[PDB]
């Protein structure tokens, strides 16, 4: 299982190379139609990316499915927060769809979710989050979020922890600073988990109220949270 | 669908 | 708080721990959905009063405005109850020790609509804590991290940095290698993502029990649930 | 109530 035999540099390289492309987009109903049309196209690329996360294709088909059903909206949100880091006060859903906070209000219940995403963006900006850190965090979300619902997965997670620490050591942080930064980063995943659960309720609500029709892949990933 | 795209 | 050493930090946290409370379990009648939810909410409501006193004793917490204290406890209360429940349950495989007179297995969870899935997640977390050999000194650090972190999105961040230093010192003093220290720190903090998840699912559950008039919610518990604006 | 108890 050469996943477990990767150096820190080789793990970073593999994650950088696995990264999905940035896709483009195009009332309450048109805005939701844009965002879910975007999500649904991104999900297809997320499946490819997952298969390139070292260690993921070592898992059974069932476990792969489970990890992606659990994690998909976290992974979309952490991508969105990353893209938006350099646009204080805005969410870069796509290069041609850059929404300010007040456009949140065009959709019922959406502004509170935009506020949480913008606050996470702001936190990443204040920590000066690096791209190499970001691809580790995203892989940790895939492997961690459904793992408790296994040894191979914990050993892969440990290697990604070693990789994060390697990046911080290389950047010249003291040991005390590396441990502190690793904690700050991992504690953000708790906030991402919270936003995903809120966003899943919201999506389900927009579906029920026929604000937006949901089709295919997106609908099945929503339905998995039942 | 997810099953199929994963294979 | 910022000038405490790691050893003073751990003492203050262990010193601050709330008591284990008893439920009002009455073994003379069968459980119904309503009576089991009654027991659990009654217990929670009594624990919340002790949680408030415990938070005031968490170094750094009383330095915040009353508004910020209220927000943090509103955000974190159910995570804190759950982590306490998972900790109490560690040495009872397959059961949840809600109270010493209320030790429930997953089949008793089935008594309340939708609770069994949440019992399963709690049992899984309790098995992870056991597999990791989570120590009391680590549990109190994790519990303080939940209180300071869950609603934080600069003084808070400094106290959180001090708790990280404290966890690392604990691991070092226990003889873990430098690499084992960071690996463990990560495994501990990644469990907080799962506790957050269970808290969100538990809050939706409690809200549905309320909206279906299964159990009356009053006072502090009612207000802490309503704070989540579901 | 929470504000009062704090
Ligand atoms: C799921 C929602 C629509 C799709 C949104 C999206 C769409 C594209 C993407 O790259 C990220 C996100 C994160 C926020 C998501 C939203 C949160 C609530 C809303 O219903
Ligand atoms: C909130 C619930 C009732 C109160 C329960 C409780 C009550 C006391 C306690 O110390 C821990 C917990 C965790 C699970 C909580 C439950 C999760 C769903 C249910 O509605």
Author numbering:
A (entry chain B): 305 to 330, 338 to 460, 472 to 548
B (entry chain D): 689 to 695
C (entry chain A): 307 to 459, 473 to 549
D (entry chain C): 689 to 694
What text appears in the publication on this structure?
The D538G-E2 complex structure was solved to 1.90 Å resolution by molecular replacement, with one dimer in the asymmetric unit (ASU). Overall, the structure presents a canonical ERα LBD-agonist binding state where H12 covers the ligand-binding pocket situated between H3 and H11, and the GRIP peptide occupies the AF-2 cleft. The E2 ligand, GRIP peptide, and H12 (until residue L549) are well resolved in the map. No differences are observed in the residues comprising the ligand-binding pocket between the D538G-E2 and WT-E2 structures. Pronounced conformational changes are observed in the loop connecting H11 and H12 (H11-12 loop, residues 531–537) in both monomers in the ASU for the D538G-E2 structure compared to the WT-E2 structure, although no appreciable changes are observed in most of H12. The H11-12 loop is displaced away from H3 and toward H11, accompanied by conformational changes in Y537. In the D538G-E2 structure, however, the Y537 loses its hydrogen bond with N348, and its phenolic side chain is pointed toward bulk solvent. The space previously occupied by Y537 in WT is replaced by a well ordered water molecule in the mutant (observed in both monomers), which hydrogen bonds with the backbone amide of Y537 in between H3 and H12. Thus, this rotation of Y537 is unique to the D538G-E2 structure, and it brings the φ and ψ angles of residues 537 and 538 out of the α-helix region and into the allowed, more sheet-like region around -120° and 60° (defined by φ/ψ angle regions in the Ramachandran plot). In the resulting conformation, the α-helix of H12 begins at position 539 for the D538G-E2 structure rather than at 537 for the WT-agonist structures.
The estrogen receptor α (ERα) is a ligand-activated nuclear hormone receptor and a major regulator of cell growth, survival, and metastasis in a large fraction of breast cancers. Structurally, ERα LBD is an α-helical bundle, with the C-terminal helix, H12, functioning as a key structural component of the activating function-2 (AF-2) cleft that governs the agonist or antagonist state of the receptor. The Y537S and D538G mutations are especially interesting because they occur at the N-terminus of Helix 12 (H12) in the ERα ligand-binding domain (LBD). Importantly, breast cancer cell-based studies revealed that the Y537S and D538G mutations conferred hormone-independent activation of ERα and reduced the inhibitory potency and efficacy of clinically prescribed SERMs and SERDs.
